[PDB]
Design a protein around this ligand. Structure first.
Ligand code: HEM
Ligand code: HEM
Ligand SMILES: N=C(Nc1cccc(CNC[C@@H]2CCCN2)c1)c1cccs1
Ligand SMILES: N=C(Nc1cccc(CNC[C@@H]2CCCN2)c1)c1cccs1
Ligand SMILES: C[C@H](O)[C@H](O)[C@H]1CNc2nc(N)[nH]c(=O)c2N1
Ligand SMILES: C[C@H](O)[C@H](O)[C@H]1CNc2nc(N)[nH]c(=O)c2N1
Ligand SMILES: [Cl-]
Ligand SMILES: [Cl-]
Lengths: 362, 362
């Protein structure tokens, strides 16, 4: 059954990929080589062209992603050659460096060896390559609550956080054959952070907020033609709302809205004053202003929605079905001010794609 | 088939209704009377108790409604006795009066004779009993674009609007047997309107915005136990966002955000300034402030979401399945600041319920 799943997924991928790449005539012969390879080895190896286009198609098929207009310009780094943890570490360090690009973020994916018999070659524990630790002791809350379980796991492995609200987690990953993951502290010279200030309200800096420049998702599985790339960290730039309306705003995250209300000088007493709404707008303005001021790429939700409209138009013109998840595409502030809110999307799963996978801790 | 649909829907309704009303022992005998009545007449007549509880259950089952906490206190007016257009008109006038209640809005439904053989006894053309006209001539846009087709229809029937941005449409409805609907101008003494001012910004009144106090939906079908009440107008009070974030804000409605930005003294030049978001918050603050100032009932989206949470808890405690439409329940401003955004809802259709029906014009 599993070999059959592989062969069926391979046929569909190669046909579609080579079609898009104007290589339709080569499908028959390539499919033959693959079937022989599957027959003999139980798997098959992608060409660099297939891997690159596969990762791009996967982005193009991500229903929840508003940033998909730029799917074809993804920078793909092929690291299927890594065998040692030093090589994995250096590949992760390099990814941070080249993606960051001094603030002018390059959307990038680094692809590590794929699963073989469902057996992982490299198992990354981080949710993102750069993320803040979180602590909860006797209801003493410090840092990012979303990171509490990974933080506890790292502190089982000999690491110790300083317990500021913004401790950088180390990279943590496990190699096939090892029982325990290893961890490496991030070189600070690689990590761009942005202090949050407001363009008009000087007091906003009293909150001493900051965020990291580059979100690099390192816990999702890239699936291409039946091949499972469980370790394939990827990044874009942020849409402002992700930081201003969720990461810093959610009650189960940094929960900063009451403090925002205070520094911008409004009461946080009555629902009818819409103080949370007002606070949300000012915090989101601050985030965009701050990233811009520091020369770190970011997009606001209106511009991103405009871009996504172009993506919809591009798909229609190319004759491709458009898929999307309305519930994730709408931004968490002023969603009805975007076109997205006023239409519907087919939420069908199309592969290649990026998928959730079980966490190796917890 | 149709008689069978009726009987099956009746059995399920009576069993459930009498169950909730602690009248389970009376189900058998009542079901017998109904089946005989259906056999002989092709339909059946609800008791006043069934009709009242049916309209309440219907509200309780409205997946898109955030205001459902108060389902059991609906004021039901039984007008199955009307036979003349004067009686229909006076029943509609009375509904406006008693629901308005000098500003302290009473959630109310007036129920007219139901369809017989799918044949309507009374056919209401209005979307809401109180609504503003809309005009579009050579790209001269006046009033509410949502009302353009109904407005054109009324002007075919001898009515003429003054062509302000806030012309009150007349009541318009058709009696069984008549080819054309009749229309009656609304007595102004019955219609409460609210001028929109801002609590802090005096210039906001320069926009000369207003809205009507009581939204009374008059174009949806109430379905109870297989009986189709096509004419059953109902009202609650507004949630502020319906006016501030949609009716006055949508580009295809009153489209006021650029003018709001101007009067509150911010630039409307750059997406990154989040001027639309800021304008939305201030316009929504103005709407709540204005309704409160005039002593007209209204609810903000945070309070309404809190109430809906209680509705969820109430359902769980009573052992009832909860159904909802996530996409409609989330408010159009700061949705992620409500609990609704962070959970999911079963969007199954449960009857009794309120449904869309075809418009008799257009
Ligand atoms: C270039 C800038 C990009 C922007 C502004 C952007 C924007 C977003 C946003 C705002 C989300 C929702 C995240 C959340 O609410 O948690 C998202 C989801 C997603 N994006 Fe993108 N994105 C970008 C690039 C990329 C790239 C390069 C990839 C991968 C190649 C990608 C794949 C995804 C995936 C898989 C999700 C879903 C995550 C999940 O389900 O948890 N995006 N994107
Ligand atoms: C008491 C105050 C009430 C509030 C604040 C409230 C709030 C709302 C809101 C905000 C919507 C969404 C409307 C839209 O976006 O167009 C809605 C939908 C709805 N409400 Fe309520 N509601 C209330 C009472 C009622 C009552 C009394 C009924 C009927 C008995 C009702 C039945 C519905 C229905 C059927 C919808 C769906 C309309 C559609 O699909 O277009 N609600 N409610
Ligand atoms: N801008 C981005 N946002 C993004 C995309 C995918 C996933 C995530 C991470 N979402 C984390 C949240 C944390 C609460 C629930 N999931 C962020 C990108 C990250 C990586 C590439 S684009
Ligand atoms: N507060 C209310 N809002 C409400 C409820 C149902 C329907 C409507 C009308 N929605 C009209 C919009 C117009 C654009 C698409 N439909 C409003 C209530 C109206 C009647 C009872 S509650
Ligand atoms: C396309 C989408 O379903 C549509 O725009 C919906 C979204 N959610 C909504 N929610 C409410 N309350 N009211 C609406 O009119 C809409 N419009
Ligand atoms: C329950 C609901 O599906 C969940 O809260 C979703 C809603 N839409 C979202 N949309 C985005 N972009 N990100 C999220 O984390 C969520 N959360
Ligand atoms: Cl994030
Ligand atoms: Cl309305």
């Amino acid at each position: 059954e599993e070999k059959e799943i592989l062969w069926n997924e391979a046929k569909a991928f190669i046909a579609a990929c080579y079609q898009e790449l104007g290589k339709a005539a080569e499908v028959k012969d390539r499919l033959a080589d693959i079937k022989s390879e599957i027959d003999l080895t139980g798997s098959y190896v992608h060409t660099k062209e297939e891997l690159e286009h596969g990762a791009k198609m996967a982005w193009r098929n991500s229903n929840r992603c508003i940033g998909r207009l730029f799917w074809n310009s993804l920078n793909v780094i092929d690291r299927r050659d890594v065998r040692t943890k030093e090589e994995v570490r250096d590949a992760l360090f390099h990814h941070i460096e080249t993606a960051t690009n001094n603030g002018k973020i390059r959307p990038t994916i680094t692809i590590f060896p794929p699963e073989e018999k469902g057996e992982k070659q490299v198992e990354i524990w981080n949710h993102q390559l750069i993320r803040y630790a979180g602590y909860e002791s006797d209801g003493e809350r410090i840092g990012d609550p979303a990171s509490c379980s990974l933080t506890a796991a790292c502190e089982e492995l000999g690491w110790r956080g300083e317990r500021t609200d913004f401790d950088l987690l180390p990279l943590i990953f496990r190699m096939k054959g090892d029982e325990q993951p290893v961890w490496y502290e991030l070189p600070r010279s690689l990590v761009i952070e942005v202090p949050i200030t407001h363009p008009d309200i000087e007091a906003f800096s009293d909150l001493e907020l900051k965020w990291y420049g580059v979100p690099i998702i390192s816990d999702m599985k890239l699936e291409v033609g039946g091949i499972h790339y469980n370790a394939a960290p990827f990044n874009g730039w942020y849409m402002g709302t992700e930081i201003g309306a969720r990461n810093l705003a959610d009650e189960k995250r940094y929960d900063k809205l009451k403090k925002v209300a205070s520094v911008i000088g409004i009461a946080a007493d009555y629902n009818t004053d819409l103080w949370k709404d007002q606070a949300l707008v000012e915090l989101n303005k601050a985030v965009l202003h701050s990233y811009k001021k520091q020369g770190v790429s970011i997009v606001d939700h209106h511009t991103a929605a405009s871009q996504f409209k172009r993506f919809e138009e591009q798909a229609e013109e190319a004759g491709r079905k458009l898929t999307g998840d309305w519930t994730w595409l709408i931004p968490p502030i002023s969603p009805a001010a975007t076109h997205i809110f006023h239409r519907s999307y087919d939420n069908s799963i199309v592969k290649p794609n990026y998928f959730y996978q079980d966490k190796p801790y917890e």
